[PDB]
Every structure is written in structure tokens, then in C-alpha cells.
Amino acid sequence: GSDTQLFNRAVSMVEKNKDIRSLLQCDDGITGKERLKAYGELITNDKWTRNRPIVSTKKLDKEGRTHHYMRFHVESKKKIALVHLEAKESKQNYQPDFINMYVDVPGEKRYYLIK
């Protein structure tokens, strides 16, 4: 499903961001590097073989522009983070455009990635 990839690329840029890497106290050395993984919301299985699919939202503005909203959680070796982002379609049936992207980490201050 294309919706899943939408969150995959969003979490990838968020987990590789050095700014957020400091909040999760991640690391990166020749002896061992930290790796982060994320998923939609509540879950209790593995892969897509049998679990809850990711849900997506679509809304049009006064101009008729449809916007998409996707939110998911991320689990690191030190804690779990929440990523929320907003995207809008440009022209028509084209690549989604993100306008707002930020994360919330427990014990740390919320950090925006786009804004």
C-alpha cells in the first residue's frame, strides 16, 4: 500500500535526523551503532502477514486541495517517540507535500523537523 510507504519515508528522515538523535541519546561508532524502528499506532504482531493496517486521513480545503494526515510511534533502545506530520497534494494526483513535521519525546522537549 502506498500509505505505508508514506509513513516509512517520514519516520526514516525523522530517525536519521541528528537533531532528534540527541534526544533519543542514540549513538554511532565502529563498535556499535544505534538503530531506530517505528510503526503506525497500537500493534501486536509482525510484518503484514496478520496485523492492523495503517489508516490515512484525507480532507479538502476551500480551494479543493486534499490534505493527508499520518501519525505513528517510534521505539528506540532508550524510549519511544511520537511522530506527527501533515501533507498536502499539489497540482493534482502528484507527490504529497509535507508542511508540518514534529516529534514528541518523553522526558525531552518536543522537536520540530519541518514547521
Curated annotation (Swiss-Prot):
GO cellular component terms attached to this protein's record: mitochondrial inner membrane; mitochondrion; TIM23 mitochondrial import inner membrane translocase complex
Keywords: Membrane, Mitochondrion, Mitochondrion inner membrane, Protein transport, Transit peptide, Translocation, Transmembrane, Transmembrane helix, Transport
Subcellular location: Mitochondrion inner membrane
Mitochondrial intermembrane topological intervals: 3-115
Disulfide linkage: none
Chief location of this protein within or outside the cell: mitochondrion
GO BP: protein import into mitochondrial matrix; protein insertion into mitochondrial inner membrane
Miscellaneous comment: Present with 3770 molecules/cell in log phase SD medium.
Protein family (similarity comment): Belongs to the TIM21 family.
Role summary: Essential component of the TIM23 complex, a complex that mediates the translocation of transit peptide-containing proteins across the mitochondrial inner membrane. Required to keep the TOM and the TIM23 complexes in close contact. At some point, it is released from the TOM23 complex to allow protein translocation into the mitochondrial matrix. In the complex, it acts as an antagonist of TIM50 by reducing preprotein accumulation at the TOM23 complex and promotes dissociation of the PAM complex from the TIM23 complex.
Quaternary structure and partners: Component of the TIM23 complex, at least composed of TIM23, TIM17, TIM50 and TIM21. Interacts directly with TIM23. Interacts with TOM22 component of the TOM complex. Released from the TOM23 complex by the PAM complex, leading to protein translocation into the mitochondrial matrix.
Name of the protein in its database record: Mitochondrial import inner membrane translocase subunit TIM21
Species annotation: Saccharomyces cerevisiae (strain ATCC 204508 / S288c) (Baker's yeast)
Phylogenetic placement of the source organism: Eukaryota, Fungi, Dikarya, Ascomycota, Saccharomycotina
Entire-sequence positions represented here: 105 to 217 of 239
